[PDB]
C-alpha cells in the first residue's frame, strides 16, 4: 500500500505500507528514508494526532492517503 506524507513546508515523500503496520512502524520508514528521529515525528490525519501503538487500518488509512508530519521537540 502507497502513502504519502507531507510537512508544513510541502515536502512529500512516499512510503510502502500495510494496513496492519502501527504508526510507530511507519515513523521508522520516514526515519529510514530521512533521517527523522521517531521520537520527535508526530503524526496527523483527518485532523487528530495519531498514536504509536494503534494501526493504519485503526484510522482508515489507505492507499493515496496522506499523513501530515509535525516535529515535537522532546527537550
Ligand atoms: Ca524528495
Ligand atoms: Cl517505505
Ligand atoms: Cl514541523
Known amino acids: ?3 504519502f506524507v507531507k510537512t508544513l513546508t510541502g ?4 512510503l510502502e505500507v ?3 503496520d502501527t504508526i510507530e512502524n511507519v515513523k521508522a ?5 530521512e533521517g527523522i528521529p521517531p521520537d520527535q515525528q508526530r503524526l496527523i490525519f483527518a485532523g487528530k494526532q495519531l498514536e504509536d501503538g494503534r494501526t493504519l ?3 482508515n488509512i489507505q ?8 516535529l515535537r521537540l522532546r527537550g
Do not use: A, F, G
Open 1 to 3: 500500500m502507497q502513502i
Open 63 to 70: 492507499k493515496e492517503s496522506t499523513l501530515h508530519l509535525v
Open 11 to 14: 515536502s512529500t515523500i512516499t
Open 57 to 59: 487500518s485503526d484510522y
Open 18 to 20: 500495510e494496513p496492519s
Open 29 to 33: 520508514k520516514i526515519q529510514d528514508k
